[PDB]
Design a protein around this nucleic acid. Structure first.
Ligand code: DCA
Ligand code: 5AD
Ligand code: MET
Ligand code: SF4
Lengths: 111, 538, 521
RNA sequence: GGCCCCAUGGUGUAAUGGUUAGCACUCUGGACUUUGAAUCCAGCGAUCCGAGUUCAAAUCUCGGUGGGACC
C-alpha cells in the first residue's frame, strides 16, 4: 500500500527504493515505469490517478491536459457517473459545459 | 462428464469470489454454491476441499481467512502432529504371559498388524500401516495433509504413540529421533547431536516432544537421557490410588514408585499427565468418587495434565471372560453421566483436561457406550445441576469464542500457589474474570532441596512451562488483531524473574525450552548451559 | 568458485544458512569479504556460475521455493552494486545486479545445473539451457526466448538432484531412495523423452542370498524389507528382474524349496512360503528363451501359500535339506523341524542354552550340525521320520573356540566339518588339523563343491573387515586373496558357490559382487 | 397451432384456503491433543413469474416464462 502511495506521491525515486523490497520482477515494472516516465507530465498525472482510481484528480488533470481528450474524459465521467464533478471543472458558455449537462440529465437518468 | 461440470462450477465460483475481493465485496459461499450448482444442473453441493484445491497462490495469500476448514485444529494456538512407533512387547511379560488384565491386543494378540493398547483401526493406525511405521514418510504425509486445509505450520509439536519407548534398544530410538528432527530440518545427519545443532537454525521452529512411560523407567539416568532429546511432558498411567488394585489388575508395581517418580520428575522440571480409570472391578461408585476427590485433595499428587478413560470390556482379555461369566458389571449410561458431571466440578483451576473416552471402533466393545460424545452430555447434566467447571481447555479464548462467541473485555493478572511433592509451586496468569476467559499462563516453582541436576544446586528456581493460547501466528507476522504478539510474555518473564529474585531468594534462573525456542530467550539475554537455558540473577 | 572475467583472479560466492550470499576475492593473495546479497529468505540450497561472454550470470536454487539470477559485469535505471578490485596496480570496477526472478515450483528447490558447453566440431557454443529439481517430483527445464524477459518453461516431465548430459540429450536423476530415473531426449520431437534402463541395489544392506540349482538367477534379501531376483540379460549383462514381495517388518532369513518356491524369515514368529506366479514365469522364459524402474514394483508380486507358527520368539536362522524333505529353523531356546508337504512338526530339540546361530544339513543327508552362541556345537544322528539322537557334542571345555562361533560347513562327501568364530580360529574335523589362524575375525566360511584329484581341499573365508582371503588344506595353505579393488568395506555375510569358477559375495556394504577364478587354478 | 400436463431446498420428493412446507439425498460444525471421510449429535437449503380474486391464497382464475406428447 505504501508503494502505491509512493506512486501517488508523483516521484519516481521514492517508488524505486520502496519497490526494491517489493519482490516483484524489475523486468515487469521497470519497462512499464520507464514508459510512464516518458509520457506527458499532466498526462502522467491523469494516468497515475486513473491507475490509482483517483478519478477526481484524473479528470482534473486531463481537463487542463488538452481539450482534445475531453470526449474521452466524458466517457470516464459517463462510465463513473462523474458528471457533477466535471460541472465544476468546466464553465458556462462552454459547449463542453452544455454537452456534459445534457449527458448528466440523460445518461444517469436511465429509467 | 459431470466431473468437468463441477470443475466449471468451481472455476466460476473462483472468478466470482476473486472479483468480489478486488473491489472488497462480501459474498456468502453457500449462496454462490447453490446458484452455480443450480445453473449447471448439479444434483449435489460442491466439496470445500476441492474449492481450496484450485486457488492460485497470488490469491491463496489472502483468501485463506475465508477458506480454512475446521478452525479448531488451531483454536489452541499450536499445531499438533502425532507419530507411531514400531510394535513391540511390554517389559513386565518377563514374568508371565500378562500384558495387563484390561489391555487390548498386543504384538501377538490375534491381530495381523496392531500395537499394544491399540486395535489398529485408528486413522493414525492406518497412516502408520501405510508408512510401514517409517517416521519421515508419515510425518511428511501428515504435515502435507494438514497444510492442505490452509493452516499455517509456523509452530509445530510432536507426540509419539506406541506401547513402551524406554524399553527399546538405544540405537533404534536414536535413529528414530534423528529421523524426526531431519524431517523438519531437511538436513541429512549422522547422530543425534548433529541433527540437534542443525534443527537449532531451522525455520519449522519445533517446540518440544512428549513421551509415555511407566514408573519402572523413571530413574535419573533415563531423565538425563530424555534431557538430550528435548522432551517436555510425560505419560505414566496411574489407574488407581489404591495399592491393592495394582496387584488386582496385575499392574506389576507399586503406587509408591509412582509417587516418587512424580516427585523426582517435578524436581527435574518436566510436565506430567496422568491416566484415570473409572469403573474398575471391586470398586464401588462411592469408591470412585472418593479416590477422584483424593486425587486433588492430597498434596502428594496434585498433577498437571489429566486424562480419563472409562472401562471398556473387550474380547481377548481376562476381563472379557470375567464379564462373560457375569461377574464384572458396568454402570448404566446415566450413572456414567452423573459420575463425569460430579468429577468435572472438582478439577482445580490449574489442571487442564485433554481428552475424554477412548477412540475404539464401536462394533467391538461388549460394554461400549452408545455415545461417541460424552463431554457434551456431561455439560448438559451440569447445566441441569447448575454447577460449572473451571478447566483450562474450557476457559481459553479459542474454545470459548468458537463455542460461545465471547470477546474478552478486561484482562488482568492472577497469582496462586500450593504445595505438591514437597514443591513450592506457583501459577501465574492473565485472564478476563468476568467471562472467566483466559489468555496466558505460567508455571514456576522453587527447586527441591534434593535434586539430580547439579546445575540447579543452590540459588536456582526452575520455570517448568509458559504458554499463551489462541491460534497460530507466523513469527514474522505481527497483528492479525488477536492476542499472540502484544508483548504479553515479556511482562510475565520480568515479573517471574522479580519474584524469584526476591521471594524465592535464589541467585540464578534456569528454564527448559524447545530446541527452536532457545533463540527467543536469546532476545532477553539468556544463555545456554547443557540442555537448559539460564540467566544470572545478580 | 569462479574467476574474474578476462583474467585469472579467483572469486568465490558462498551461501550460508542466514538467507543471504557472501562473496570473496583473492586479491593480495587472500580472499576478502567483498559483498553480500540480501535476496530471498531461506537456506541457500545451491549456487552456480555461468560465464556468458564478457559477463557472468549466477543461478541460485533456493530453499525459499524461488530462483533468483544476478550477473557480474565490468565497469530510468535501478541501483546496481559495484566495487573496485586491485589487479597489478589497476582498480578494475565490477558491477552486479539482479537479472531475473523465476518461480515455477512449490516445494524446496534442490539443484540447478547449467547446460555444459561443448564442441560443434571445434565450435564452442554457449547454450543457456538450465535444469531444476524440487521435492514435489517436478522437473522444469527453464529457458529464455528472443524477447522472454521472464524465462519460458518447457516440458515438465516428472530426488535431491537431477544431473545433466554434456550435449544435453541425456538426463538423469535419483529417486528419493533406492532406484533412480534415467531419461533421454528423442530426435523426432524436441519435446520427446524416453526412460532408460539403470542398475540398482538393496541400498541399505543384504543379509542372505541363494544360488538357483539351474544356475541362471539368484535371489537376495536385505534389511530394506525387500527381495530381489537377478538374471543375465541378452541382446551379456546380469540385471535385477523381480521384487517378489515387500514386507512390513525386516527380513533376515532365506531358504529355497523348489523350482519356484522358497521360504523367508522375518522379525515375526511366522514362516512364509512363496511360489512364482505364472505371468512372471512366462516373461522370464521369454527372455531366457528389460524391466523398467516403475513397472517392476507394479507387476512383480507373488502369492503366499502357507503360514507357520510355533517359535516363541522371532526366527533367527533357516535351512533346508538337499533332498528337500525337512527344514531347520530356530528363534532366539528350541529347535523346530518341518515336513515339506505336511508343513507340521516332525521332531523338536531343546538342547542348547543360548541363541542358535547356524545349521548345516549333511550333504549326504546323514547328519545335521548345529552351531550356537554358547560356544558349543551339537550333532544329531538320524536313525533308520527317524529321530535325531545326539551322535556327539561338546561341553564348555571340549569346545576349541574361546569365543562365539559364527559359521560352519560340511565336506563335499560329508567327511569333515569346519567352524569359524570371532576369535579368528579355524579348525578341521574328530579334529584332525592344527589351528589355521589368519589373524582376522571369521565371519563366513565355505568349501569347493568338488575336490581336485590332488585332493587339495580349498576354502573361501570371509573376514570381518571386508577382506576376502582364500586358503587350501589337504589332509596332512594360502593360495590367493582379494585385491584392494575387489575388497568390501564391511563384514561378510554369506559366501555361496555355483553348483551344477564362480561364487557369491554378499557383503554388508549393500553390494552384491560376483567373482570368477581360473578353472584350472 | 391449439389442446392438455409440469414447475417445492443444490437434487429426489410429501404436504395444502389459514399463524409454522415434512421428509430424503447433499453440504457444514462439535465431539477430537489419534478422524475432512468413521459414530453420534447439531446446523444451513426452497413452492417459475406477473396479474387477479378470497378476511385470508402455492393450492380457485387469468396472463407470462420455460419444459414435456397429440394431428
Ligand atoms: C517452549 C516451547 N513451547 C512454546 O513455544 C509454546 C508456543 N509459543 C508461542 O506461541 C509464543 O512464543 C508465546 C506463547 C511466547 C506468545 O508470544 P509473545 O506474545 O509472548 O511474544 P512477544 O509479543 O512478547 O514478543 C514478540 C517477539 O517474539 C518473536 N517470536 C515469536 N515466536 C518466536 C519463536 N519461536 N522463537 C523466537 N522468537 C519468536 C517474534 O518474532 C517477536 O519478535 P518481533 O520483535 O519481530 O515482533
Ligand atoms: C492410555 C491409558 O489407557 C489405559 N488403557 C489402554 N487400553 C485400555 C483399554 N482397552 N481399556 C481401558 N484402559 C485402557 C492404559 O492403561 C493407560 O492408562
Ligand atoms: C499406553 S498405556 C500407558 C503408557 C504405558 N504403556 C504404561 O502403562 O505405563
Ligand atoms: S503397560 Fe500399558 S501398554 Fe503395556 S500392556 Fe500394560 S496397559 Fe498395555
Amino acid at each position: 500500500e505504501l508503494y502505491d502511495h509512493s506512486l501517488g506521491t508523483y516521484d519516481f525515486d521514492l517508488v524505486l527504493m520502496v519497490a526494491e523490497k517489493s519482490q516483484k520482477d524489475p523486468k515487469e515494472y521497470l519497462p512499464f515505469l520507464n514508459t510512464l516516465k516518458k509520457m506527458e507530465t499532466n498526462y502522467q498525472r491523469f494516468t497515475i490517478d486513473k491507475y490509482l482510481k483517483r478519478y477526481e484528480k484524473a479528470i482534473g488533470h486531463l481537463s487542463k491536459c488538452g481539450p482534445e481528450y475531453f470526449p474521452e474524459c466524458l466517457n470516464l465521467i459517463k462510465d463513473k457517473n462523474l458528471y457533477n464533478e466535471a460541472l465544476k471543472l468546466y464553465s458556462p458558455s462552454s459547449q463542453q459545459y452544455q454537452d456534459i449537462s445534457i449527458a448528466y440529465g440523460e445518461h444517469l437518468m436511465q429509467e | 462428464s459431470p466431473a468437468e461440470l463441477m470443475m466449471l462450477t468451481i472455476g466460476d465460483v473462483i472468478k466470482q469470489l476473486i472479483e468480489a475481493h478486488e473491489q472488497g465485496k462480501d459474498i456468502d459461499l453457500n449462496k454462490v454454491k447453490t446458484k452455480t450448482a443450480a445453473k449447471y444442473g448439479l444434483s449435489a453441493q460442491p466439496r470445500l476441499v476441492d474449492i481450496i484445491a484450485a486457488v492460485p497462490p497470488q490469491y491463496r495469500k489472502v483468501l485463506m481467512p475465508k477458506l480454512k476448514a475446521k478452525p479448531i485444529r488451531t483454536a489452541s494456538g499450536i499445531a499438533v502432529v502425532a507419530v507411531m512407533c514400531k510394535p513391540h512387547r511390554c517389559p513386565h511379560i518377563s514374568f508371565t504371559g500378562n500384558i495387563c488384565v484390561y489391555c487390548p491386543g498386543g504384538p501377538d494378540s490375534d491381530f495381523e498388524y496392531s500395537t499394544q493398547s491399540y486395535t489398529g483401526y485408528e486413522p493414525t493406525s492406518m497412516r502408520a500401516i501405510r508408512a510401514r511405521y517409517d517416521p519421515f514418510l508419515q510425518t511428511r504425509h501428515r504435515i502435507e495433509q494438514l497444510k492442505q486445509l490452509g493452516h499455517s505450520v509456523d509452530k509445530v509439536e510432536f507426540i509419539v504413540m506406541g506401547g513402551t519407548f524406554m524399553a527399546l534398544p538405544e540405537e533404534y530410538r536414536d535413529y528414530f529421533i534423528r529421523n524426526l528432527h531431519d524431517a523438519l530440518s531437511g538436513h541429512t545427519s549422522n547422530n543425534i547431536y548433529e541433527a540437534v545443532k542443525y534443527s537449532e537454525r531451522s525455520l519449522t521452529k519445533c517446540i518440544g516432544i512428549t513421551i509415555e512411560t511407566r514408573p519402572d523407567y523413571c530413574m535419573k539416568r533415563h531423565l538425563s537421557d530424555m534431557l538430550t532429546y528435548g522432551c517436555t511432558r510425560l505419560e505414566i498411567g496411574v489407574q488407581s490410588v489404591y495399592e491393592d488394585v495394582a496387584r488386582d489388575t496385575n499392574r506389576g508395581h507399586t503406587v509408591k514408585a509412582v509417587c516418587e517418580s512424580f516427585h523426582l520428575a517435578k524436581d527435574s522440571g518436566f510436565k506430567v499427565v496422568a491416566h484415570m480409570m473409572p469403573d474398575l472391578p471391586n470398586v464401588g461408585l462411592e469408591r470412585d468418587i472418593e479416590q477422584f476427590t483424593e486425587f486433588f485433595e492430597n498434596p502428594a499428587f496434585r498433577p498437571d495434565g489429566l486424562k480419563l478413560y472409562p472401562t471398556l470390556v473387550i474380547r481377548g482379555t481376562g476381563l472379557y471372560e470375567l464379564w462373560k461369566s457375569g461377574r464384572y458389571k458396568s454402570y448404566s449410561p446415566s450413572d456414567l453421566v452423573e459420575l463425569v458431571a460430579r468429577i468435572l466440578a472438582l478439577v482445580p483451576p490449574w489442571t487442564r483436561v485433554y481428552r475424554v473416552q477412548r477412540d475404539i471402533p464401536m462394533p467391538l466393545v461388549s460394554s461400549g457406550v452408545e455415545h461417541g460424545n460424552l463431554r457434551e452430555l456431561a455439560l448438559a447434566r451440569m447445566k441441569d445441576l447448575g454447577i460449572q467447571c473451571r478447566d483450562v481447555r474450557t476457559r481459553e479464548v479459542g474454545i470459548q469464542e468458537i463455542h460461545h462467541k465471547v470477546r474478552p473485555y478486561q484482562v488482568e493478572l492472577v497469582r496462586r500457589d500450593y504445595v505438591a511433592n514437597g514443591g513450592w509451586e506457583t501459577f501465574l496468569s492473565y485472564e478476563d474474570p468476568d467471562q472467566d476467559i483466559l489468555i496466558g499462563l505460567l508455571r514456576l516453582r522453587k527447586c527441591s532441596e534434593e535434586t539430580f541436576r547439579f546445575e540447579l544446586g543452590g540459588g536456582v528456581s526452575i520455570v517448568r512451562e509458559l504458554h499463551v493460547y489462541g491460534s497460530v501466528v507466523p513469527v514474522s507476522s505481527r497483528d492479525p488483531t488477536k492476542f499472540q504478539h502484544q508483548g504479553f510474555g515479556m511482562l510475565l518473564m520480568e515479573e517471574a524473574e522479580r519474584i524469584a529474585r526476591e521471594e524465592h531468594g535464589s541467585g540464578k534462573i534456569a528454564v527448559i525450552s524447545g530446541v527452536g525456542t532457545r533463540n527467543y530467550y536469546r532476545k532477553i539475554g539468556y544463555r545456554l548451559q547443557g540442555p537448559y537455558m539460564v540467566k544470572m540473577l545478580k | 568458485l569462479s574467476f574474474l572475467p578476462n583474467t585469472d583472479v579467483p572469486i568465490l560466492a558462498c551461501g550460508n544458512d542466514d538467507c543471504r550470499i557472501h562473496i570473496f576475492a583473492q586479491q593480495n593473495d587472500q580472499f576478502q569479504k567483498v559483498l553480500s546479497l540480501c535476496g530471498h529468505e531461506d537456506w541457500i540450497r545451491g549456487v552456480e556460475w555461468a560465464a556468458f561472454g564478457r559477463d557472468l550470470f549466477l543461478a541460485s536454487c533456493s530453499q525459499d521455493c524461488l530462483i533468483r539470477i544476478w550477473k557480474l559485469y565490468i565497469k530510468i535505471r535501478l541501483k546496481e552494486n559495484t566495487f573496485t578490485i586491485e589487479n597489478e596496480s589497476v582498480k578494475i570496477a565490477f558491477a552486479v545486479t539482479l537479472e531475473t526472478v523465476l518461480a515455477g515450483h512449490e516445494n524446496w528447490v534442490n539443484a540447478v545445473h547449467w547446460q555444459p558447453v561443448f564442441y560443434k566440431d571445434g565450435v564452442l557454443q554457449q547454450p543457456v539451457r538450465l535444469l531444476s529439481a524440487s521435492m514435489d517430483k517436478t522437473m522444469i527445464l527453464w529457458a529464455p526466448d528472443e524477447e522472454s524477459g521472464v524465462w519460458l518453461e518447457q516440458v515438465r516431465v516428472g530426488f535431491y538432484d537431477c544431473q545433466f548430459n554434456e550435449d544435453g540429450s541425456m538426463i538423469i536423476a535419483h529417486a528419493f531412495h533406492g532406484a533412480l530415473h534415467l531419461w533421454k531426449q528423442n530426435t523426432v520431437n524436441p519435446r520427446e523423452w524416453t526412460p532408460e534402463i539403470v542398475i540398482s541395489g538393496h541400498f541399505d544392506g543384504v543379509q542372505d542370498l541363494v544360488w538357483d540349482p539351474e544356475g541362471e538367477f539368484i535371489i537376495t534379501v536385505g534389511t530394506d524389507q525387500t527381495t530381489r531376483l537377478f538374471a543375465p540379460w541378452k541382446r551379456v549383462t546380469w540385471h535385477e528382474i523381480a521384487r517378489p514381495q515387500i514386507h512390513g517388518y525386516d527380513l533376515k532369513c532365506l531358504a529355497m524349496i523348489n523350482r519356484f518356491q522358497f521360504v523367508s524369515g522375518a522379525d515375526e514368529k511366522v514362516l512364509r512360503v512363496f511360489s512364482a506366479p505364472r505371468n512372471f514365469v512366462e516373461n522370464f522364459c521369454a527372455i531366457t528363451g528389460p524391466p523398467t524402474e516403475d513397472h517392476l514394483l507394479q507387476n512383480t508380486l507373488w502369492p503366499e501359500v502357507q503360514k507357520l507358527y510355533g517359535h516363541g520368539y522371532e526366527i533367527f536362522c533357516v535351512t533346508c535339506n538337499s533332498s528337500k524333505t525337512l527344514l531347520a529353523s530356530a528363534c532366539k531356546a528350541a529347535i523346530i523341524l518341518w515336513n515339506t508337504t505336511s508343513w507340521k512338526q516332525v521332531q523338536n530339540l531343546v538342547f542348547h542354552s543360548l541363541t542358535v546361530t547356524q545349521m548345516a544339513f549333511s550333504p549326504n543327508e546323514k547328519f545335521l550340525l548345529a552351531v550356537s552362541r554358547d560356544r558349543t556345537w551339537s550333532l544329531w544322528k538320524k536313525q533308520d521320520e527317524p529321530v535325531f539322537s545326539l551322535f556327539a557334542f561338546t561341553n564348555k571345555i571340549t569346545s576349541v573356540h574361546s569365543r562365539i562361533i559364527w559359521s560352519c560347513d560340511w565336506s563335499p562327501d560329508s567327511k569333515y566339518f569346519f567352524t569359524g568364530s570371532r576369535d579368528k580360529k579355524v579348525v578341521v574335523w574328530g579334529p584332525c588339523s592344527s589351528v589355521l589362524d589368519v589373524g582376522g575375525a571369521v565371519t563366513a566360511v565355505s568349501v569347493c563343491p568338488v575336490l581336485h584329484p590332488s585332493q587339495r581341499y580349498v576354502v573361501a573365508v570371509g573376514l570381518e573387515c571386508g577382506k576376502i582371503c582364500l586358503y587350501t588344506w589337504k589332509k596332512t595353505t594360502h593360495c590367493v586373496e582379494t585385491s584392494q579393488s575387489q575388497s568390501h568395506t564391511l563384514a561378510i555375510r554369506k559366501l555361496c558357490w555355483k553348483n551344477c569358477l564362480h561364487f557369491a559375495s554378499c557383503g554388508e556394504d549393500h553390494t552384491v559382487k560376483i567373482h570368477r577364478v581360473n578353472k584350472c587354478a
